[PDB]
Amino acid sequence: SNSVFGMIADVANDIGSIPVIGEVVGIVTAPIAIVSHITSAGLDIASTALDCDDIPFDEIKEILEERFNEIDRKLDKNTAALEEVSKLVSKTFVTVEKTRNEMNENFKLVLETIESKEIKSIVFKINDFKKFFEKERQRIKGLPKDRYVAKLLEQKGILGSLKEVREPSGNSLSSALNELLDKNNNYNKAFQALYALFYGTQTYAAVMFFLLEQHSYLADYYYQKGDDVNFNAEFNNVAIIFDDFKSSLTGGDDGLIDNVIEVLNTVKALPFIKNADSKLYRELVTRTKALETLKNQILIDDIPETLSQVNFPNDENQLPTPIGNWVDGVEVRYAVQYESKGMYSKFSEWSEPFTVQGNACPTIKVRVDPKKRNRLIFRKFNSGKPQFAGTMTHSQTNFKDIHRDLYDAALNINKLKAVDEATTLIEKGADIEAKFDNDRSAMHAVAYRGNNKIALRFLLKNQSIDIELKDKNGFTPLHIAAEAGQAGFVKLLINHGADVNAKTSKTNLTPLHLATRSGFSKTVRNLLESPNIKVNEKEDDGFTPLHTAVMSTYMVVDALLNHPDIDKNAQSTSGLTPFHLAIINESQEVAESLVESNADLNIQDVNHMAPIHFAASMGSIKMLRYLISIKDKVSINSVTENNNWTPLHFAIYFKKEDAAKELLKQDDINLTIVADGNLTVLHLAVSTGQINIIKELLKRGSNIEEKTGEGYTSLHIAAMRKEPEIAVVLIENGADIEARSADNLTPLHSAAKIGRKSTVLYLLEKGADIGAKTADGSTALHLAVSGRKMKTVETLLNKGANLKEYDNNKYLPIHKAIINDDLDMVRLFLEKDPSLKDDETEEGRTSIMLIVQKLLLELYNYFIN
Amino acid sequence: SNSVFGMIADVANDIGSIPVIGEVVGIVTAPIAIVSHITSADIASTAFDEIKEILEERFNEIDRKLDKNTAALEEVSKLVSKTFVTVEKTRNEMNENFKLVLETIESKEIKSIVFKINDFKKFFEKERQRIKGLPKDRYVAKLLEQKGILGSLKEVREPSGNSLSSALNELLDKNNNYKAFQALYALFYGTQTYAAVMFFLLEQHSYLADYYYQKGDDVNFNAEFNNVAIIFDDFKSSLTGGDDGLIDNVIEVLNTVKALPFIKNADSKLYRELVTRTKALETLKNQIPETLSQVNFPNDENQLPTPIGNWVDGVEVRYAVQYESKGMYSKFSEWSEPFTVQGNACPTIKVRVDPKKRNRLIFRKFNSGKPQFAGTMTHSQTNFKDIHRDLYDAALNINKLKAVDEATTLIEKGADIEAKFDNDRSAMHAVAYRGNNKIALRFLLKNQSIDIELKDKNGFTPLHIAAEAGQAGFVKLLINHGADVNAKTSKTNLTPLHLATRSGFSKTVRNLLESPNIKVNEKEDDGFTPLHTAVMSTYMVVDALLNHPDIDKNAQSTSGLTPFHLAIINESQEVAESLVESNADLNIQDVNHMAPIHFAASMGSIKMLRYLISIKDKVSINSVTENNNWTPLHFAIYFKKEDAAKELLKQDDINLTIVADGNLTVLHLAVSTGQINIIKELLKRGSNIEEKTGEGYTSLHIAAMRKEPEIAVVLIENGADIEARSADNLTPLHSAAKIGRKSTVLYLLEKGADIGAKTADGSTALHLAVSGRKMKTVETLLNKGANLKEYDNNKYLPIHKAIINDDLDMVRLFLEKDPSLKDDETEEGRTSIMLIVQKLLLELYNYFIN
């Protein structure tokens, strides 16, 4: 179940939950655990042998936050769309890596032997190189941004020398080709070696890819607030990397073309004996030819210039004016570069930081460039700015830099100073609403910062822009201010109104839902009053605004509880009321407020669990006490509609054995609950192996013996429990030693199957009957000789107390051993068990039958005795 | 011996009472020397700076530790230190047999690599021991540059591991084949060494980060946290992860050779408990970004921009916030976002960006290192940080009128004092540490219940801060309330009187003594009194305590330290005179049973020595003790304080008739020293030349058994007998022979010593010479006391020992070179033959028969 449930966890990883940020670590871990439990539902005993029952219970969470951090390592919507390179290469990588996934077992099989030829040693060495690659690959993806780039900053050169592999075995492959020529001519070991050479080629190509995307991510990191200058260096490095890539690929693929030629030559010239292994080989030859044709699918335009190309000295409205943010004296770190058609070329050359008390109006000959490539300049002052000063389609005259200046003025936090900045800019009145950082940054940002009063009263011309203006992420200004609590400006916007139920472009959500977790009771009332918005709104994932409001736990939920016409209860995608979250989010005040508003609508989830069982699952001791203090909703003693389980069963089954003690100490608990298999919760505890609650229930007078419909008894469970103390524990409790199966399978037979000799000897001093026998008539001796457990059958022969007699079938236990044919045990049995094997059966024919049955070895002739 | 005093040093190191200035570095170094003397308290001994060097370096190591409530990662530091000690115990234990491995040399060719890893061990040990010797500044300075070398080493250990796995392959080969035991033991040594080195590196980096916390660079704090995380992850992958670390290989080798049907040495069993330790260690080892982007408070009311110097006008802002208060304190850097902010201090701090179940503490900064702290609470907070910050800032200022202005303004602006800062209650106790005008007490007067009982991080009350600050006026201003003058702090519970004595603000302690109503008689940690702290203070302030209260002037401590001895150590003659005038001399013999003159000799303070001489009152210059009746003169004898020794010699009542244990007198001590000039001065004074001992030894008995002859020349100038018998009748010739100094016997015989002396046993000088078997001694005997051929009751002739001791040339001198001419030397002359035949003898013994 470890691998299969790990794959289920990887499926949950591919879900990518955190974009809909409603996943608390608890509310993502505990549901995953219960999902695993439900998918592995059903009860037995073989699981309870520590085979597949509870092997993982917590460390799966490790992979869970793995999934989360690999998810969030993705670029936070990098303003440049240059990530299409990484996207393409990852798409190519997925298929090749799956093919390598099958080739993994293929070439674990390919390990059939070593040194059929001397080249096979080199094959093994390059195999070890591959396994080095695979070992290094796993650790890479885990770490978050800072640690990720830290690990990046050293292994890149190692990988570069790995592609230019320290031992360029290609000529060794060519020599292997020359040898396998004759090797295939003679008839194959070289037949087995073609798989190896092809696998090496695949690993080669995969390593080239891996280098490529790691470089691409490094470039991305240096792009978004990274090393600005080193972005250009890294891009040139990856360009040269691609050049050497292509050239060495042409050479290696000339070799591979020779390989294909000789493969066809062998196919035609060979006799008609081959391997279907080579048939899958030829299918992958087709695949590799496709990937070979794939190779053809793939700043100078930007930076042969400086800023002083065409200086604009001065004129009206742009005279040198001392303005705070536009400081007079600090550098002018100009930088113009390319982006268009998704393609992006970014340079970093602030070659002219020349400072004057003048104006930045000069033009840089943008209008004359013949190439139809869109350009963009960004002019830092003293350090790496957000890098989006001015986007010019065909011309820049500082006007878009002026737009950025207005944008920055909108980022001020001083109110009257912001008004003064607004006056200064409206002297010229640059184009508001211009998009920066791929965001409709002007109006959204001014709404975020505030002073929406002045912005509205000066620029109230387009309410549609005020409402349905969406950014790179597809964000309305309402969503912009949702988590930012511009309550007064919420009145400002609602005065002319806005889309109450606007949905963002990706992971469609109300701005209300965005504001739900902000805990802004002073802001939410505005939407709560004016339009009477749909309180029962469900996003792309069916979580109520109430659900998304349980996060804050503040008085916002209390205001929302009852004042409007609310869906006081609902059902989530997996069947989760806000009461479920309140139980799990551990906000006791909100739980009490909800109890005040309405009674507990203890509706079960999709897999038939009420919020009661979660507390037993995670030992929610404080809420456990509070819910007992409710004194009502006695569903703590109810059952799962799925399979009739109380929360006590889950508490015992998760080893969280404190809330169980609490519940036991609460009141007169009903332990007579029966579930799938008629297994008492006592039997479940016996399987788990917790003596404390065991004797605790014993004090509460729990019924020791209620035979289950599964055929087992708690005595058998103890006989198979690896903790031999529990059987004795039940012994002083007075548990009947004859707590046997309906099939009369005593736990002696169980232990004979198990091999737990200590519990065997236990039952020996306890004097369990040895002359007894189960339904087929077989004493536990027969089961043991079927299983052939050495020390167990030794103790048996010590205390067999049986005459080695015929069962329902005429076999003696020695005949059972004969059928087993355990030659060492057969010889052990022949004499130490007194032989007397003359006329044992009718004329002693049983042995004679075993002669005349078939061709029998002379070993049996010796065993005749 | 030396290790015993090292253990005593360690015990002294453990307790923080000596870091408490109630005992000072000199004041603790001196008792170490005297305790070394006491534990040291003959004959063979006749034939200390390093101790105090060890003490001072260990106290420096204690000083290297950081302050209380300083930084984070402290649980990691503590646990890693604990397991580091645990590992180092076993490593030190196993080092001995690791060395013993290096004797079965070259049964294997990889023994060169074994020597290589041994040299690796030597390098590591030298570096790590060289680390633990420097003060904090030198400590961090040394760690700085070589942190890179240490990090390099962290991987440069790789060929050790690779060659070690290869060696373990060959070792499984060897053990399953049968000398591999030593190599497997070296395997274990490599494993333990790797683990220990890694833990050492982690602990060192942790402490370095902790130091960087104290106004260093938070960016550097993130860098160091990243480094420690990466190193621990390297550990995990290398030795615990899915990749099979060497521990898996060693466990499988143990299991495989466990099935070996062979009988093997106890080395395997010891390695088995070693592997038990390894798997226990294996089980042990196998287990925020947000910003006030927009929300500046608008003028709801009372923002009222004031030109506050504290909240500087025109500067920018910086900020970050991290989680603390339970276990770890994950740390983060977000100063990319801070930018210019002016107008009035009104940032709506907005904790609620991710209002999770964590206590996130924002620390606020600007251009340089800043106060960098603002409040703590889960839910919404509304910029009371500004007001509280300026509040403790006013409490911290030194311009009292400005403090008045700020206190008047900000309280009206709206906040509460009770909220802490820097985890301190600085807005309330910086008041005591800087003094306060009336309005501080006026504002605090409303409750009369906040500041008085206000425990700090260390639990101090304003009593303690005021007492150390010595702000006597503000001391009265507060004690108008009259709180617990006995407010003992949480750690190192003491009285504010102790603090005042330590500081030296006499006005404050006079004010305390004006209306104490206190138990001034407090006895602190080591049985001391506040009078002892005053003695440390070395000022006339002690007079106020001396006169008015009723303290025990004759106060003795746990170690036997009187205030007299403390003054002697400190050497303030004015204070000593004041103490003498106060009450009686506490010249009582202490726990070690010493006298103040003993310390006067110990430090060699001739100033205080002469002052005590001029006292003449109870100045028991010839006082002896219960333990061996040591005199201060005796201590001056041992410590070779020759100047003070002769100085006191220039006085009258210098008792030359001192009898110690076994009658080892002052002249005997002078002999045992070797300072000849002092002995000559003593003889000029005229002590008993032939002062004897319990074993009937004159001073020349021991002077002879020395390594220089000129001392015997001085004694014979004095006129000591050259044939003075002993209890064993060991004449000076006998003593001179029993050591092996030929020149001593030479000068004895120049004066006419009796060569023919022979003890009751019959041990003639020839017998002693052959007993020492020295060729020079025996040839001198043959020169003078040639051959008496004596024996015991069992007739052991000199030739009998001469042939037992197996020396060739001397036997030839007896029989061939200068023949003894004695054939048939014994009864029928076959006692020699009797010894030839008695039992098993030597292959080469045939010539020794002669």
From Swiss-Prot, chain A:
The entry's keywords: ANK repeat, Cleavage on pair of basic residues, Exocytosis, Membrane, Neurotoxin, Presynaptic neurotoxin, Repeat, Secreted, Signal, Target cell membrane, Target membrane, Toxin, Transmembrane
Organ and tissue specificity: Expressed by the venom gland.
Entry's Gene Ontology molecular function annotations: toxin activity
Domain of life per record: Eukaryota
Protein localization: Secreted; Target cell membrane
Complex and partners: Homotetramer in membrane.
Protein family according to the UniProt entry: Belongs to the cationic peptide 01 (latrotoxin) family. 04 (delta-latroinsectotoxin) subfamily.
Keyword Signal (UniProt): yes
Domains: entry comment: Two helices (H2 and H8) are predicted to insert into membranes and form pores by assembling into tetramers. The helices are contained within a helical bundle domain that undergoes significant conformational changes during pore formation to allow exposure of the transmembrane helices and transition of the toxin from a soluble monomer to a transmembrane tetramer.
GO terms under biological process: exocytosis
Function comment: Insecticidal presynaptic neurotoxin that induces massive neurotransmitter release at insect (but not vertebrate) neuromuscular junctions. Native toxin forms cation-permeable pores (with high permeability to calcium) in lipid membranes locust muscle membrane and artificial lipid bilayers. May bind to insect neurexin-1 homolog, insect adhesion G protein-coupled receptor L1 homolog, and insect receptor-type tyrosine-protein phosphatase S homolog, and induces neurotransmitter exocytosis both by forming tetrameric pores in membranes and signaling via G protein-coupled receptor.
Organism per entry: Latrodectus tredecimguttatus
Portion of the parent chain present: 50 to 928 of 1214
Name this polypeptide is given: Delta-latroinsectotoxin-Lt1a
Annotated spans, Helix H8 is the probable transmembrane region of the tetrameric pore inserted in the target cell membrane: 193-212
Chain spans, region Helix H2 is the probable transmembrane region of the tetrameric pore inserted in the target cell membrane: 15-40
ANK repeats: 401-434, 438-469, 473-502, 507-537, 541-570, 574-603, 607-636, 643-671, 677-706, 710-739, 743-772, 776-805, 809-838, 843-865
Gene Ontology CC entries for this record: extracellular region; host cell presynaptic membrane; membrane; other organism cell membrane
